[PDB]
Design a protein around this nucleic acid. Sequence first.
RNA 1: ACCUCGAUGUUGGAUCAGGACAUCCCGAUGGUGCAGCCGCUAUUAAAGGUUCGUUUGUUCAACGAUUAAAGUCCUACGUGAU
RNA 2: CCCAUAGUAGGCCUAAAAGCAGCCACCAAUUAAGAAAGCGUUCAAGCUCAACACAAAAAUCCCAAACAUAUA
Lengths: 205, 148, 42, 157, 140, 118, 146, 80, 37
Amino acid sequence: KPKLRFIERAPLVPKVRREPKNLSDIRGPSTEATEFTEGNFAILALGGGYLHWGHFEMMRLTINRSMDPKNMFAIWRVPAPFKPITRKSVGHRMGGGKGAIDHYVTPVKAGRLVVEMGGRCEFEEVQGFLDQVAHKLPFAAKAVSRGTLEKMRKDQEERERNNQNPWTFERIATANMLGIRKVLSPYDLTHKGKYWGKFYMPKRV
Amino acid sequence: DYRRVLVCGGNGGAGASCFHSEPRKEFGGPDGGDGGNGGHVILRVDQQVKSLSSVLSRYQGFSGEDGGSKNCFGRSGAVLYIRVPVGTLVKEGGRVVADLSCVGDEYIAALGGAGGKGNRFFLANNNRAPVTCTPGQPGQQRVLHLEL
Amino acid sequence: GRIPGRQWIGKHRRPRFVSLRAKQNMIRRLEIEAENHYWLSM
Amino acid sequence: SKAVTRHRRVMHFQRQKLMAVTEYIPPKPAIHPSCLPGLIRLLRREIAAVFQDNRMIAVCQNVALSAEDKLLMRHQLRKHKILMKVFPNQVLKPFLEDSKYQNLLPLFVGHNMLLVSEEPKVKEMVRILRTVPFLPLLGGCIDDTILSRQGFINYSK
Amino acid sequence: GVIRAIVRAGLAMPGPPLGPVLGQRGVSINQFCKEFNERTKDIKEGIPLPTKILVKPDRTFEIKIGQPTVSYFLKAAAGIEKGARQTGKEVAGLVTLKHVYEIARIKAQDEAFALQDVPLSSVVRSIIGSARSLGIRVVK
Amino acid sequence: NTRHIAFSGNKWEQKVYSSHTGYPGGFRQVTAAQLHLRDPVAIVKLAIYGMLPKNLHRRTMMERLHLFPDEYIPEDILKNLVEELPQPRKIPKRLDEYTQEEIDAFPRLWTPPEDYRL
Amino acid sequence: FREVVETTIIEGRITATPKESPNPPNPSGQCPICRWNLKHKYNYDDVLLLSQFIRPHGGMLPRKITGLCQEEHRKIEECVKMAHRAGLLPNHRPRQLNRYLTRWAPGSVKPIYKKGPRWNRVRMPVGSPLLRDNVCYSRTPWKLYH
Amino acid sequence: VKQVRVQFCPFEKNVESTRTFLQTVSSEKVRSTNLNCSVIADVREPCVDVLFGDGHRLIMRGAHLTALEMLTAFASHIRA
Amino acid sequence: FKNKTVLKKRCKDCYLVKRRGRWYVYCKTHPRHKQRQ
RNA sequence: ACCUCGAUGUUGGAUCAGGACAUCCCGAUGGUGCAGCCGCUAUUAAAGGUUCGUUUGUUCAACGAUUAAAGUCCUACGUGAU
RNA sequence: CCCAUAGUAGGCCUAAAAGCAGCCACCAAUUAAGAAAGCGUUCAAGCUCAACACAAAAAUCCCAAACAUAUA
Ligand SMILES: [Mg+2]
Ligand SMILES: [Mg+2]
Ligand SMILES: [Mg+2]
Ligand SMILES: [Mg+2]
Ligand SMILES: [Zn+2]
Ligand SMILES: [Zn+2]
């Protein structure tokens, strides 16, 4: 089945209980599906965000149309929309309780791989439409091969090791130098200053 | 001689659903104005026109404005007229939907969708605060073939 | 060109920019505290 | 506002100063480094063999001809034992010094097409060239004896 | 300008494949098919034949012809009327190397087709590749 | 010589002087070049006006400012003059102004190929 | 330098060509600028330096011929544009407001009718960013925008 | 264009300008539309002559010239 | 001219030129391709 | 739900209009499925203009007749110590 | 930038689809050009290509004036 599988709008059995909007699921680096699996090419998420069924349909249609079924194959590296987002009836004042489940979505964290391509095909043969899909995506995304991913990572360690600035965000935050922990989040100690909200700053060491 | 044309009638505006509120009358009642009708596309026969070069291959009947607040209605879509030579057979699927031979003759190809009602339209003694606002009906979209 | 609401508090605030003078002040304080760390380390 | 926002939230001025102070600083690589200081062998052996196989050689500039005209010229040449050859100057320039042809250096530049043979049908070849008033005969070197065009004409006559 | 056609010698006036295609430049279809039938009489009858007609600017015909096609020739040699579908695994007829050589003997002789390579290898390899692309196996 | 001032960058075209006559639609925005052509003194006058302190003494100070577009100056003003201030910007020299001795002194930087049109 | 002369019969003659001054301060350098130790020490008004890479009518000379680095060629081109706009090359012309350090062509910049607020002011560029790495003899870095 | 003649002496010091000139312009890729011309390559400082039977003769001593210069001059003269 | 934030050459003859302060895609064969930044 | 509940009802209309241009017309251009006329689309332009009637408070809307056009808005849904 | 012969219109398919509607194969000559990468073709014909050679906009009127280079 060398084609991208269809993703349902919502799980067959919905969540009766409304759950809170824990934005930590979008905040911070991704810890799952951060490495290539049975593929060579992928769309890397350079920022956190929520993927709707609309985004899923966009990705599926574009990739299926613009890939060769016999040689190129695609695989989802993100679960189908499962987190329920509730929208109150339009035009109602605040209060009265949490609204009903309007839609379903899937969280995605920075560094996460959304779709993974593979097969007998080089990187430039796929860069075009993968980058178009990345631009379409709701968060900063990049068409990254295994080689490009490793290259950018190694460049990150190179920047960290050769930066001539005596002062690093990690050093200052961990040491609580200027009392800056009065202004930083406890998560900043682990984000090392490279993450702000759902945005990831690759340029920053 | 022969032209395939895509006439798309206008779409009626969707009625608004709002409610009035003024200093000394807070619950002033519905203000949802009705939407304007879509402008029909009518092929009018023209004696001066002798060939179907003039007629375009894509006609989009103007859509009516949506109803506003304060019971404001929506300007209905203006009628789009396609000047055609005298003696122009109009066929959908080999149906000869029209002949259009006489001067002054005209055939309505795509009727603009009617405008949607507002809540004030449904206002009544029984219904003292309607929330309904019927959506503006879509306009007709058909492919007509013109043969001299 | 006006900033909606009240400056420095709302979602839309006056953009604030760091001057070289501010960076130098912060670096000076950081150096002082690095020396403090060294002298507390023994 | 929440910790995560659809827009880039405004950092506290202290955090902004922290980020600015901790920005990355690349190293300066001293003085600017930039401002600081088997088809090939197949052709090699083929040309080495050809230089001995051939007894008479000439060169021309058959680049002004079309596909069909070049094909017709090829058939006319194959009517005789003469074989036409094409090789890059990039690899022929070494071949001149390799085979000890110093006088041949200012002859092979641009499109050069050899006409190796052992029996001169040069009379009929020049006759064929005559009806096409272009494509001049160029200098050559028969049996290690450089011949100019006048030499070729004398040898033909 | 040169016009290339693969018409069958048996039927000199198929119609569309010659009329509209040749009429753009301006031709005499009667003379064209008369010369085509003359060549058909000169050669065996009922076989596709490539043509090398060159419509001169003077509105004159210079019809040049050579050997029959290669695909139909190989199919007939193998006793095949329609070529194989897969052509990678399917096969309908087998032709021996000796037969291939024999047919090649009368192949590298045409001028327009440019099949004038002195070595036998250049022609035998080409025809072998053509047969392989076709649904024909090369015996031994 | 206020007519002969020079702006750095593209200020001649980018810098805009805005005034408003007070009447509706009386907002006039005139580029620096247009203002200079209209009045060869307005640019310097406005620069000095904007640099002076914003109090009641500003116009008394401006009364002491004498701006002349060209070399000509009134005889009484010339007799009044006491000192000449050094020009804030040293005017760069042109090639036409450079002496042949300086041209020879400055080394040739590169060997131009002989076979070049130039 | 070869010049084409007509009389129609036309022919080219090679005339006297200048040569690099003897004893470069830094031999074995990539570009002439580096060879002569001028990496960050020439400005738009250094006409003596600039004109050595200039066609007689004012156009720049190709990098292949000049031998300059890519960045040095860009810097020279920008400095030459600035010098021409400042009128420092009166003799290198194709056949009145005084300016200098003009980054953009005078006829391609629109007036700043609505300068932004203090935090988003629309500044007028001065000089060129390509010369941002020039030698800095001042306490404060030179401002490229005014 | 009426007639053209190209002459060069590769036996003497080589001059690639005229060689490239005759390789480029003196090709049937151009003569197909410029059929009016009559080319001749009499080879033996070099010389390219162009005879316009109306009133003109253009002589090019393509020693110090280059292919681009001589082609541009030829095109300009053809435009006349 | 069509105003585009990203200028793309459509055919072979389309050429990019920076005129009067902004980029333009000019085309002789298909002047339909005229684009302005 | 942040100012005003220790005399400002509100919507329309009249009067006068100030302003933005995201231009309805008039001006200048590019493209066109631009032969011409009509047009469609885009750039630039806000100096000037942008109708009168029937029903209905009505803004709006429908309809009648026109116009080069009968533009979208903001101005305390401009203006009621007029 | 230059430049393009050709087994042949590779077969099946189809009225016919010939590199280019689809399927199977993708070999093969000439020093070299894919049984074709895109246009174009009803189909052809023709064009090149890979070859060989060589960012923004709103409504009273923009909004300190300015300044690129004298030493920390
Ligand atoms: Mg405020
Ligand atoms: Mg509260
Ligand atoms: Mg505008
Ligand atoms: Mg409001
Ligand atoms: Zn250098
Ligand atoms: Zn184009």
